[PDB]
Structure 1
């Protein structure tokens, strides 16, 4: 089940895959959970998303050292907001190579984030340009179009039934999407559907602010995003 490690929660999702969860008390919004992923690829570990803070992200690295005890070869972060990139400095202090969408790196300063060290770029069809994502192992990175933000990216894990939608995807019982100022209202619905089509066989949809869900999370997020266009 859930594994409490200090103020963080870790949950094994598949043999080589764990979800990390961290919390931030946001005035006016309560204590908000954010989820990312940890993947073991042979003798190395790959991280998807930081925690909200540097201190929490250092604790993720501490958990990895205790439960896996292999080097963290790289981290990929899925857009320039605090839940996904708030802990970049902790990754850099630990010597970990970091990757984000070029657009996330461009937006990072004005969003109050530290940029990743390397920039991913994407083909017109959304798949990462392979030269920009060297040694990514099973991580299959896809840009579905603007939605939750202009720069949001998504990640499939080869050899598993898991795809990670980040903050683009909400769960199948979610009530709304909100009126968030960074969202692309014109394109959000198509981007959600493009994520589902990019990972057509993934049956476990992992996301930033809900527990893992079936593919109904995609249909429901899209079906909900329709009523904004």
Structure 2
């Protein structure tokens, strides 16, 4: 409802069960789910839903299996196309807590190989398939077959060592997950698993990988301008 961390609801948001959905482009929506921590309040987390070529592609789970099943039910009601695959952007609960729900639904799942290696240690179910990356950060194409417009980029260690990012070709949208914070953020969030030496370069690498995108989507704020990238990088410069 009214998160302690994460954006508030605004015009253009559709409530569906315990989740919120917002259309960002003709074929792209943002999903938002909430983890209610007793004595603290709710923490919102955002991911994406993309319609491409008669199928739906999901970026990130919700915090829980039940919330992720609700995402799939929203897709069934609003889009009514098969969900071909999901990409999850690192091995933490806000991005991978709902993997079992995707697997039960027959959806193929993909994550950075390192995310799958870390997953059990982080309390997560690993994805079924591992993405690997060139030294320049771009996904190795044979590991990401039939990805439609999704352009998957590993920017380097930052929020975690395994964090990946996703652009949507043909749109104005790029997704930074938990790496990118908004242009008005006062902190970089949870740095407990973070690489404070390399964070700034990784944020800048994300910006340079998706130079055209004007709508920067992220895990814990509303979509922002490219100022979110510059601000995240400058905040991260202070950690070195």
Which bracket does the TM-score occupy, shorter chain normalised?
over 0.9
Q: Secondary structure at the match of 1:134?
A: coil
Contact 2:91-2:119 within 8 A present in 1 as well: yes
Length-normalised TM-score, structure 2? 0.94
Contact 2:158-2:195 within 8 A present in 1 as well: yes
Q: Following TM superposition, by how much is the alpha carbon of 1:29 offset from its aligned partner in structure 2, in angstroms?
A: 4.2
**Structure 1, residues 50-78: CA drift from partner, whole Å, max 9, x if none?**
00000000000000000000000000000
Q: Following TM superposition, by how much is the alpha carbon of 1:14 offset from its aligned partner in structure 2, in angstroms?
A: 0.2
Q: Following TM superposition, by how much is the alpha carbon of 1:30 offset from its aligned partner in structure 2, in angstroms?
A: 2.2
**Structure 1, residues 65-122: CA drift from partner, whole Å, max 9, x if none?**
0000000000000000000000000000000000000000000001000000000000
Query: What is the number of equivalent residue pairs in this alignment?
Result: 229
Length-normalised TM-score, structure 1? 0.99
Q: Following TM superposition, by how much is the alpha carbon of 1:25 offset from its aligned partner in structure 2, in angstroms?
A: 1.1
Distance 1:150 1:27, change over 3 A: farther
Distance 1:28 1:188, change over 3 A: farther
Q: Secondary structure at the match of 1:191?
A: helix
Q: Following TM superposition, by how much is the alpha carbon of 1:178 offset from its aligned partner in structure 2, in angstroms?
A: 4.2
Contact 2:53-2:148 within 8 A present in 1 as well: no
Structure 1 segment 95-106 matched on structure 2, within 5 A = 95-106=106-117
Distance 1:179 1:212, change over 3 A: closer
- Structure 2: which 5+ residue stretches go unaligned? 1-11
Q: Secondary structure at the match of 1:25?
A: strand
Cα distance in structure 1, aligned partners of 2:196 and 2:190: 9
Cα distance in structure 1, aligned partners of 2:70 and 2:25: 21
- Structure 1: which 5+ residue stretches go unaligned? none
Q: Secondary structure at the match of 1:114?
A: coil
Distance 1:201 1:105, change over 3 A: same
Cα distance in structure 2, aligned partners of 1:195 and 1:133: 19
Q: 1:22 corresponds to which residue? A: 33
Cα distance in structure 2, aligned partners of 1:137 and 1:195: 20
Cα distance in structure 2, aligned partners of 1:39 and 1:165: 16
4+ long deviations beyond 2 Å: 26-30
Structure 1 segment 1-229 matched on structure 2, within 5 A = 1-27=12-38, 29-178=40-189, 180-229=191-240
Q: Following TM superposition, by how much is the alpha carbon of 1:176 offset from its aligned partner in structure 2, in angstroms?
A: 1.0
Cα distance in structure 2, aligned partners of 1:24 and 1:148: 19
